[PDB]
Design a protein around this ligand. Structure first.
Ligand SMILES: COc1cc(Cl)cc(CN2CCC(NC(=O)COc3ccc(S(N)(=O)=O)cc3C)CC2)c1OC(C)C
Length: 367
């Protein structure tokens, strides 16, 4: 129904991810923790790093249990000591669980200078958790140890705000209807993109090109990340549709900034982007549509928030900030609906529409 306690529990800064307040240990130790669907580890600062406001102090927790094991996690790195302790979310469900915690003792280019978060909540599946799949992720522990339903939902909104509804759906956070795409495999939140359209025109590419290796839903990524060939054809079309005004080379690369007079931003010159996702029924698909407001991130000055990806399509904060996303882990599917907080002009709106007939959808995925 409605979970008013959990609404507006997320804070952040443009491009620095969304964090939620969490308690660790007994007595409670408040920490700000990143919300990440692209990783599976629950890890926190445990040593007095210069960038940290606070850190997890294991000596102050009576309910801390040492696992006597080390964990290494590199990025495009941190190193910590494994243990368990009582974890709870103050603006979440009235429950407490004994979850695995990686106390970060040493980190290189992990913590951000000036940021207000002290850790990371990996919400993805065990298979990509470090060191191996035997380390239970937070959410898996939560479901086993309480009567919280195996489901969470995210409403990310363009300092920055949002809502994470743990264990249910808040129906005021979206308009229209939820359309579900299946989770292909339980590691990352993997989905299949079956068609891409720019302002109505199909990109006329093989659907395997959209999902090369894997396509994922990731709150830990800021941009919409398209594969090499897919991204290049997309920019080509956006340039064509917005050839009315001048743009430097670095803009489309994501380097330079484009500005207008306060309220002179021409949204109409920019095309909409539509991603078609595999549906619940055989040969059935549905499309999700994003406005320029989603893929042009404010920094009125803006920045081009679509870039190249080392994998398939990565549906980052750009996509998610337009939609209310339901991570229905119980039924191995991900739901999409128009976000009630998504930024839109009066003329056009972001949409979730269906059903469409798309044949040979299974072929679009990587083998
Ligand atoms: C403020 O910064 C962060 C905010 C948040 Cl909420 C989380 C993280 C850590 N996340 C760890 C998981 C990672 N997601 C994945 O691995 C998912 O898969 C891909 C994603 C993108 C590409 S690519 N390179 O093609 O775009 C390729 C792949 C395979 C995102 C980052 C943040 O990063 C800092 C702390 C280091």
């Amino acid at each position: 129904g409605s979970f008013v306690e959990m609404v507006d529990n997320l804070r952040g800064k443009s491009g620095q991810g969304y964090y939620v307040e969490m308690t660790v240990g007994s007595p409670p130790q408040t920490l700000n923790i990143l919300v990440d669907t692209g990783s599976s580890n629950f890890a926190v600062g445990a040593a007095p790093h210069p960038f940290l406001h606070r850190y997890y102090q294991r000596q102050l927790s009576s309910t801390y249990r040492d696992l006597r094991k080390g964990v290494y996690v590199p990025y495009t790195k941190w190193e910590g000591e494994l243990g368990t302790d009582l974890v709870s979310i103050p603006h979440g469900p009235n429950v407490t669980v004994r979850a695995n915690i990686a106390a970060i003792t040493e980190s290189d280019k992990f913590f951000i200078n000036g940021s207000n978060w002290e850790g990371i909540l990996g919400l993805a599946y065990a298979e990509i958790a470090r060191p191996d799949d035997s380390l239970e992720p937070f959410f898996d522990s939560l479901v086993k140890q309480t009567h919280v339903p195996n489901l969470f939902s995210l409403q990310l909104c363009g300092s920055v705000g949002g809502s994470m509804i743990i264990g249910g759906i808040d129906h005021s956070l979206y308009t229209g209807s939820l359309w579900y795409t299946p989770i292909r495999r339980e590691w990352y939140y993997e989905v299949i993109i079956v068609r891409v359209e720019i302002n109505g025109q199909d990109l006329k590419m093989d659907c395997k090109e959209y999902n090369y290796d894997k396509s994922i839903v990731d709150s830990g990524t800021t941009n919409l990340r398209l594969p090499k060939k897919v991204f290049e054809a997309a920019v080509k079309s956006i340039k064509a549709a917005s050839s009315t005004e001048k743009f430097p080379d670095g803009f489309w690369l994501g380097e330079q900034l484009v500005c207008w007079q306060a309220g002179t931003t021409p949204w109409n010159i920019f095309p909409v982007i539509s991603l078609y996702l595999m549906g619940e029924v055989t040969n059935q698909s549905f499309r999700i549509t994003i406005l320029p407001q989603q893929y042009l991130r404010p920094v009125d000055c803006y920045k081009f928030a679509i870039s190249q990806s080392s994998t398939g399509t990565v549906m980052g904060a750009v996509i998610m900030e337009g939609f209310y996303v339901v991570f229905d882990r119980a039924r191995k599917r991900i739901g999409f609906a128009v976000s009630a907080c998504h930024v839109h002009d009066e003329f056009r709106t972001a949409a979730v529409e269906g059903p469409f007939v798309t044949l040979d959808m299974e072929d679009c995925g990587y083998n």
